[PDB]
Amino acid sequence: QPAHLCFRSFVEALKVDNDLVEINTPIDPNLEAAAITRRVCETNDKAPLFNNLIGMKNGLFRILGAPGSLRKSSADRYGRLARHLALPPTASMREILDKMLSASDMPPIPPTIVPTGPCKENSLDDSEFDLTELPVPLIHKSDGGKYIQTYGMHIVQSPDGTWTNWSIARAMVHDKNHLTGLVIPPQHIWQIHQMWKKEGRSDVPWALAFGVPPAAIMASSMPIPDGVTEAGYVGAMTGSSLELVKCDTNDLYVPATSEIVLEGTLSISETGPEGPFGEMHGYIFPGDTHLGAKYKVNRITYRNNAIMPMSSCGRLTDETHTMIGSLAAAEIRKLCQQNDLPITDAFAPFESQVTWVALRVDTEKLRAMKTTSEGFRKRVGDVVFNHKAGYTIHRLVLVGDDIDVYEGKDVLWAFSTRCRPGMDETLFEDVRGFPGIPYMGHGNGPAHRGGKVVSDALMPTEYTTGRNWEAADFNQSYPEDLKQKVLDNWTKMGFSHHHH
Amino acid sequence: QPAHLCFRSFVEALKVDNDLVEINTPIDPNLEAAAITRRVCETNDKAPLFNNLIGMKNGLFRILGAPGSLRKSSADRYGRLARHLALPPTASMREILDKMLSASDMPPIPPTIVPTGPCKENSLDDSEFDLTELPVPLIHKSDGGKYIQTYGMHIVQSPDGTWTNWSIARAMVHDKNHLTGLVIPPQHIWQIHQMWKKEGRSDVPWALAFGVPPAAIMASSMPIPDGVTEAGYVGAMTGSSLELVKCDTNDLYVPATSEIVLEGTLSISETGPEGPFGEMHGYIFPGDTHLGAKYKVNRITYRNNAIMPMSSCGRLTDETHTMIGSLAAAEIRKLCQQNDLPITDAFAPFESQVTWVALRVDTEKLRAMKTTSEGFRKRVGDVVFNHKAGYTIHRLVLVGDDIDVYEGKDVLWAFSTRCRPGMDETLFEDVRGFPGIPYMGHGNGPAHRGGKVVSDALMPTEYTTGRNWEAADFNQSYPEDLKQKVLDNWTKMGFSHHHH
């Protein structure tokens, strides 16, 4: 099976790429596997595959860390991501995001039901597993539980059957047959849960599939629109219908090649302790347990020699940056264009801990609008901060065409030099806020509201007559023939490879 | 003579360090020398010494570019700066700034007058030079003149004789015997000029010395207090009295080993076209000529085989970042401590284009103050933004003890995650602003006023009971014995030198 359509194939692909380290000696899921993965993520090293995990029994389980993290070279920096999508390993971020957005103006390709698959190779009923006896990792020393779920896909369906959502949300082991996790507004798992809670008759049928097709986990991490079934969007994106098998204990469908599947229910009434967890912004607040949603597990099915993917998330750079930030930025780009705003590109700078999105403006189009900073900032912020795709983002930075928003140095330069604090900014206090940011949930104000800003790093003439500066840099402050002379004589004179 | 006390010796020191490229083939001062230097600065390469400059005659002049720019290795990143100060080349920024602040609580060591020096080896009277025939560089393609003065020291004295100021301010050739340049508030050259203009009797006696003692050019770039003679501060800092010779045509004193000295007057009445110039924030606005101050040159004296230092300034990283930003930050640290604020360290992040200063707070001391963010932000901003040392800085970022303010990634992390936009910030509109920042002088508001902010990246418990988080990083989220195990087994497992 192709790497983008089968996680087991993806793992081979990383090997083939010389992007995997197989660790065949015993590694402890209590902190060690996550510590190694954390080091990998902070240094852009090869992904670790833990083949000998202390506590693995009867095939459950191996761990792959850092599945969507960065490579060290600049030329294939995003190669792990490209390998989720059938793209060349040298693909740019623009290319990856465009691939993720491509299905937005295509007919869905609905999934194909098949009678079996590798995820049915083994099974454990309600009398044969205990989630506290599996080698579930403790990811951070202060975590409030063992987070089994950092890179699987939750599957829930509206009560009317019309929308089946696939999404990533964290969950930890509560007891032998339950998890607790985040189910929060405005996320689709929460929107669907509220539909079942209003109906009031039963718990939500649920499945959690780990080691799904890589193209599916990418869409699981993306804020595609309300009511859109991720499986058909992934089908359209890949050009192929995904093969799904029915769960044994409910009528949901899971990818045929899923490594591990939990089947059960998400309660409409019960909660349990959840967190704290070392989170995407880089922090854990020890002892901040809150109540989360509660999941009951009725059955486990799994591949022979099953592999559990794991995100050891925190400080830069991991899946919570590369995927959450970038995929939100992609959706925000589209949303702005659909609202007739002249945005060409969007990216969440890693330097901002993916709390900012930089929006590149087509300033020829802006000029034709004959508008002003205040008016344009308000328009952009109203579109983005009132939408679910803007949930995680607290600062939007508007920049002109000379800025490559995928280059954080250039975004920082523009922000620092082109946006006058206060005057060039509009604050938004009456929008949904993201509590996970420390200055929100542990800050001075309401955890769930406000704290957002549009920072306009467009210069005044960009709205009127055109850019009126040149950069004081080698590229712009010297003519072409001189530049080339310098470059051609560089090593000759005594001064000091793309791939590496 | 020691490298910190003699520019010619400094140039040898860079050679010895394998930090110099000598270019002995002809190089054009029209753009080429500056283009090479610009490339050096953007890539942290070796400093270029142009020994065969097209237009050099009778010893005037060679050029040294990038005298205070960065080296490529992390271990000696600031080594050029350290070589201005007799510090080991591996000196940290903290060590450099502490050296620069050390004279602040020492008695001055006034300079020693000597009868001659190398700067008297050659001379040109009022009938024998023409500044338009020297090989003055065109530094950026759109500059409004040839900027002779990018790394020399202006020398002016109060009318009462009590204060002799040394400072860097740009100047360009106006005609055969005049320069024009920036003389702007609140700078000391401007404060002294205003004293002479109020007296109304004569132009200001002036000298401009190029290739001065490196320790002197560093103090020239630092906002030491009003009324403090830089020569005695440098004397105290170095432990040695500087040797100075009298000018021939006036009674000012110049460093004995200066490479090139201009003697003349700074007018109290005349102005001429000045700029535009590719400036420290990374921009040039072509055609934005303004009127600047006007200098008359009466005499030139110079060393045999004189060398002119040059800053090819603009985008990161050059002297306008390493020296202006860092030295302002140093002075701001001291100023805050003298105002009883619990600041331990200050640095202007390069990523901010040196428009921010991050202030590290001793949070044990803060806790004892029993204050709040709003009150503390206001206090800090009132101290800094009302003082000359705060002139160039538009954003102050307050961070707690876990943040190394000399590491821009960590400052950015804290700012992005700990300061809630709007709520955690205080804007200052009734303070002097820095017009050079594009969003000031070419922006939407007054060029000279406001646009400043204090951004509080202290978390709430830092004011009360203490930090209440751990970072989600390898350092903080894993115990010591595990961390060391990981590190000790890193290369064994398959994963991947300080000097490099």
Ligand SMILES: Cc1cc2c3c(c1C)C(C)(C)CC=[N+]3c1c([nH]c(=O)[nH]c1=O)N2C[C@H](O)[C@H](O)[C@H](O)COP(=O)(O)O
């Ligand atoms: C890549 C990724 C995405 C996580 C995520 C993680 C990763 C690795 C974790 C598991 C390591 C840490 C926390 N995660 C959560 C999360 N969204 C959320 O509601 N709760 C979460 O706990 N997300 C983001 C979420 O997947 C996106 O917001 C999707 O848009 C949600 O899908 P939906 O639009 O269908 O609701």
Ligand SMILES: Cc1cc2c3c(c1C)C(C)(C)CC=[N+]3c1c([nH]c(=O)[nH]c1=O)N2C[C@H](O)[C@H](O)[C@H](O)COP(=O)(O)O
């Ligand atoms: C290192 C350095 C410092 C420049 C400088 C440059 C460099 C390389 C240039 C020449 C390349 C670009 C512009 N410069 C100017 C400047 N200050 C100023 O008033 N006008 C300037 O034109 N400065 C900053 C100035 O030297 C500091 O603000 C000092 O504190 C001034 O000394 P003072 O406190 O005695 O007034």
Ligand SMILES: O=C(O)C#Cc1ccccc1
């Ligand atoms: O645990 C965390 O890092 C988280 C989270 C989250 C929640 C909603 C949307 C995106 C990320």
Ligand SMILES: O=C(O)C#Cc1ccccc1
């Ligand atoms: O209660 C919510 O709405 C929430 C939340 C949350 C918690 C942790 C990380 C991200 C969001």
Ligand SMILES: O=C(O)C#Cc1ccccc1
């Ligand atoms: O109810 C509140 O004020 C709260 C909260 C919140 C939610 C998630 C994470 C952190 C704080």
Ligand SMILES: O=C(O)C#Cc1ccccc1
């Ligand atoms: O020409 C520029 O880059 C400049 C400048 C300046 C002026 C005052 C204080 C610091 C820098």
Ligand SMILES: O=C(O)C#Cc1ccccc1
């Ligand atoms: O007119 C002033 O006060 C000024 C100024 C200035 C110009 C260029 C760069 C920095 C400051």
Ligand SMILES: O=C(O)C#Cc1ccccc1
């Ligand atoms: O008088 C003004 O408004 C002005 C100005 C200014 C000064 C220096 C640089 C840019 C603008």
Ligand SMILES: [K+]
């Ligand atoms: K999704």
Ligand SMILES: [K+]
């Ligand atoms: K602006």
Ligand SMILES: [K+]
């Ligand atoms: K000075």
Ligand SMILES: [K+]
């Ligand atoms: K704060």
Ligand SMILES: [Mn+2]
């Ligand atoms: Mn969805």
Ligand SMILES: [Mn+2]
């Ligand atoms: Mn001074």
